[PDB]
Design a protein around this ligand. Structure first.
Ligand SMILES: NC(=O)c1ccc[n+]([C@@H]2O[C@H](COP(=O)([O-])OP(=O)(O)OC[C@H]3O[C@@H](n4cnc5c(N)ncnc54)[C@H](OP(=O)(O)O)[C@@H]3O)[C@@H](O)[C@H]2O)c1
Length: 279
């Protein structure tokens, strides 16, 4: 049960800290060395590469931005695959798609490495409080074996099914999240235009996850992530790719994509998704 954690971002940092607190964290990896520093200060081994990390643990969790970043971390010249022994389990917790999850699992099995896709919901607040919802695709036996590890980071732990099914469920989640977030921003734009009392607006509206998590920041003009707009943009692209594959029309998701693609183009990709139309 030794875990190595790769990617110490906004979600990754507090997630890895939960695992450390639970006694599971043995090693961390970050592209940018500085973020490993509080882990080194707590005696966590800081790896020189994902391969160096993989050599030393039984489970590798990946919490990195997008699928190409997962590819690099797993399959690059000093990727996980170069240091892993057969039997290692890889758990991808960031967000991509069912097709990516299945390609990761296929490529990994060539090395005798097991794979689960376990993306999460609950944002930065959930990661910090260890109350994340976790939605898991892969072998059902591995789900059960990793449950104590998942319980260290979240609360509602859900087995979705075969590989790819965690990502599926996350893409469904992201559709809801994008539109709930657009729903809020548009509400507030109209409230502001109608000269309404923000304290009262907040009272009446508080309803969705987005409003609960982001309204108090928005009202303060704190535009910081939170969850990065460039990340929602990637998530929605995966959403529309899957919708196209299966001939479902999601014109809401398509508009959300455009709006977030625009925010990225405008140079606000690093702001919270809640900053849409206020940046
Ligand atoms: N924040 C949320 O609300 C939230 C909620 C659920 C899921 N997610 C998903 O979780 C994932 C991470 O989110 P985050 O908010 O933690 O993002 P973030 O704060 O931007 O962190 C991104 C992390 O990925 C690392 N990274 C990126 N590309 C890499 C590469 N090619 N090689 C190695 N490391 C790489 C970054 O390293 P550096 O430190 O060197 O930049 C950083 O540790 C994303 O898939 C996101 O969509 C986010």
């Amino acid at each position: 049960m030794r875990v190595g954690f790769i990617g110490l971002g906004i979600m990754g940092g507090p997630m890895a800290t939960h695992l450390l607190k639970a006694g599971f964290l043995a090693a961390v990896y970050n592209r940018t060395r500085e973020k490993t520093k509080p882990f080194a200060e707590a005696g966590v081994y800081v790896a020189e590469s994902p391969a160096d990390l993989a050599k030393r643990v039984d489970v590798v969790i990946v919490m990195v931005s997008d699928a190409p970043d997962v590819e690099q971390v797993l399959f690059g010249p000093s990727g996980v695959v170069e240091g892993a022994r057969p039997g290692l389990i890889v758990v991808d917790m960031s967000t991509n798609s069912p097709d990516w999850a299945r390609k990761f699992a296929e490529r990994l099995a060539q090395y005798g490495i097991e794979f689960l896709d376990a993306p999460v919901t609950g944002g930065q607040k959930g990661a910090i409080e260890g109350t994340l919802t976790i939605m898991v695709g892969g072998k059902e036996e591995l789900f059960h074996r990793l449950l104590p590890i998942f319980k260290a980071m979240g609360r509602d732990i859900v087995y979705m099914g075969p590989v790819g099914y965690g990502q599926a469920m996350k893409l469904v989640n992201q559709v809801v999240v994008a539109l709930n977030t657009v729903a809020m921003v548009e509400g507030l734009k109209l409230a502001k235009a109608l000269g309404l009392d923000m304290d009262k607006v907040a009272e009446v509206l508080t309803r969705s996850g987005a409003i609960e998590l982001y309204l108090p920041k928005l009202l303060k003009g704190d535009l910081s992530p939170g969850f990065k707009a460039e990340h929602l943009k990637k998530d929605l692209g995966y959403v529309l790719e899957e919708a196209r594959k299966r001939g479902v029309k999601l014109p809401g998701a398509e508009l959300a994509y455009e709006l977030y693609r625009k925010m990225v183009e405008d140079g606000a990709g690093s702001l919270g998704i809640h900053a849409l139309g206020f940046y």
